[PDB]
Design a protein around this ligand. Structure first.
Ligand SMILES: N[C@H](CC(=O)O)Cc1ccccc1F
Ligand SMILES: N[C@H](CC(=O)O)Cc1ccccc1F
Lengths: 300, 237
């Protein structure tokens, strides 16, 4: 079990760790988060009490280094840093742990939620969507735009998700215009899966990462990307059976986890109604259709 | 974006544009079968592709064989339309290719956009005008060439005859739309108006009779009266 310690908490802030969150008061004796499960990516995120504008945060994997948070009063945010000196980092964490100045990652033993949300998410793929190669962790915030959003403005601060565009030459084979537009299987299976992602695991990883950035940061381009990757599958007549079953599980846990009060902004009515009720896969997402109908029947 | 009454003179500027109407592409007669079920029999159709500035009508005749063995024909018909308009554009020299293609029905937008991905500078647009181009098949010489076709065929017609020698393209388009609206509202009466006088003939190389300027004003008035008459008969006014 790993630890993300804090030098201090000089500004009042709501701190998120994966799907959990807690409040820290201005100059409260808070030195970080302990007992973080090894084996998964994690995200630690922030919303300042005095400016809820800009949620921001860091994706990281404790197996890749010793990371900690220090407030920067010049740039006005909590920054993640890497400590190269292992000995000193373990001793400082040890002292923070002896003085009980850390919150414990509050995982219920029965609870597979975070695994189920991050099953296919890898740090190495995160770092290719979020380009900042000098760091082993990746910063995301509410305002970052995607490469596709910029085509329709700072490239260094962009989310390089795979561009999906149903009315593009990439999606449509010359001479198969109607076929490829009404049945996206070519675009899903040959262009995206075989061509770009290489396998469905990488595709689901980007999908899951897009959802998490939408949920935790309100990142609008991430929400667009999540819906596009769902629609591309649902709008393909030919999808491997194992992918549809896995998609159903992925979406189920995403819908289960979504804050009820954010449904209005995180869920696209058109995409979901199309996917569940009109698409080729309208009958292939049993678990997801049942939770959507019981939890968000208004959207449908 | 969409084309409406605010930007109406744009039709007659010097940017090449085409209207595309697909309403006569897939045409059927519905009839009873021996067993008392209902079935359709396709008849020949046409794409109506018109340059409103010049009167150029590229009438692509859609022969019933194109539907043989196909399903969801009403959906296919929009994509067949898009395919043929795309083929027509590619067949034209670059300096004759349209800058804009205006579809009379919004369901043509996606099929045509997809077929024209190779032409990103050609704007595909809907219109809020209710244009009476479905009545094209009420023009006898156009109906005749469609029904006689035994194979796919592109027939070329100037839909303004020689009117542009005497009137502007705005006025010629207004005349055309009034004639077509009348033929759409009461074809029998409209044709009666157009031919009641045997001394005014249709030249072999024309579609409409050789009316003088004064006679066109009379005809145009009679067509308005017809449209108003039918509007009353319809609504009891
Ligand atoms: N701030 C420490 C050294 C520096 O200031 O550069 C790094 C550090 C902070 C807090 C917990 C562990 C740890 F290694
Ligand atoms: N002189 C041409 C007529 C012809 O030779 O068929 C002008 C024309 C070109 C293209 C489409 C229709 C049309 F009336």
């Amino acid at each position: 079990m790993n630890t993300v310690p804090f030098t201090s908490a000089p500004i009042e802030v709501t701190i998120g760790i994966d799907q959990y969150s807690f409040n820290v008061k201005e100059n409260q004796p808070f030195h970080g988060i302990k007992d973080i499960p090894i084996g998964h990516v994690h995200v630690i995120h922030f919303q300042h009490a005095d400016n809820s504008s800009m949620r921001y945060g860091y994706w990281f994997d404790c197996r890749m280094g010793n990371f900690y948070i220090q407030y920067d009063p010049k740039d006005g945010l909590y920054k993640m840093m890497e400590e190269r000196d292992g000995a000193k980092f373990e001793n400082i964490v040890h002292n923070f742990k002896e003085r009980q100045m850390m919150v414990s990652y509050p995982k219920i033993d029965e609870d597979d939620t975070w695994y189920n949300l991050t099953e296919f998410v890898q740090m190495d793929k995160i770092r290719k969507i979020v380009r900042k190669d000098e760091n082993q962790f990746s910063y995301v915030d509410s305002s970052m735009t995607t490469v596709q959003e910029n085509e329709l403005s700072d490239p260094a601060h962009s989310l390089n998700y795979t561009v999906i565009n149903f009315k593009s030459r990439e999606a449509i084979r010359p001479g198969h215009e109607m076929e490829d537009f009404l049945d996206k299987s070519y675009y899903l299976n040959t262009v995206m899966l075989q061509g770009i992602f290489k396998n469905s695991s990488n595709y689901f990883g980007e999908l899951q990462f897009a959802f998490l950035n939408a949920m935790f940061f309100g990142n609008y381009g991430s929400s667009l990307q999540w819906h596009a990757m769902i629609e591309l599958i649902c709008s393909s007549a030919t999808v491997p059976k194992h992918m549809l079953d896995k998609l159903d599980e992925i979406l189920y846990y995403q819908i289960k986890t979504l804050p009820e009060q954010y449904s209005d902004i995180l869920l696209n009515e058109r995409v979901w109604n199309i996917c569940l009720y009109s698409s080729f896969q309208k009958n292939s997402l049993h678990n997801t259709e049942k939770i959507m109908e019981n939890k968000y029947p208004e959207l449908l | 974006g969409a084309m409406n009454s605010s930007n109406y003179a744009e039709l007659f500027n010097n940017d090449i544009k085409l209207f595309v109407d697909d309403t006569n592409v897939y045409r059927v007669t519905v009839h009873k079968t021996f067993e008392g079920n209902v079935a359709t029999k396709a008849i020949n159709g046409c794409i109506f592709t018109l340059n409103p500035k010049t009167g150029h009508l590229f009438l692509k005749i859609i022969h019933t064989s194109v539907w043989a063995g196909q399903k969801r024909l009403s959906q296919l018909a929009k994509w067949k339309t898009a395919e043929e308009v795309s083929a027509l554009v590619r067949s034209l020299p670059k300096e004759e290719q349209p800058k804009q293609i205006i579809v009379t029905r919004k369901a043509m937008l996606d099929p045509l956009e997809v077929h024209m991905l190779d032409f990103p500078n050609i704007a595909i647009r809907p219109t809020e005008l209710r244009l009476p181009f479905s009545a094209a098949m009420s023009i006898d010489k156009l109906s005749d060439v469609v029904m006689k076709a035994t194979e796919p065929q592109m027939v070329l017609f100037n839909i303004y005859d020689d009117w542009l020698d005497r009137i502007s393209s705005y006025t010629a388009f207004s005349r055309l739309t009034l004639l077509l609206r009348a033929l759409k509202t009461n074809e029998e009466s409209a044709k009666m108006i157009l031919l009641s006088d045997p001394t005014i003939t249709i030249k072999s190389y024309h579609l409409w009779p050789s009316f003088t300027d004064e006679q066109w004003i009379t005809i145009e008035s009679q067509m308005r009266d017809l449209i108003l008459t039918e509007y009353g008969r319809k609504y009891n006014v």
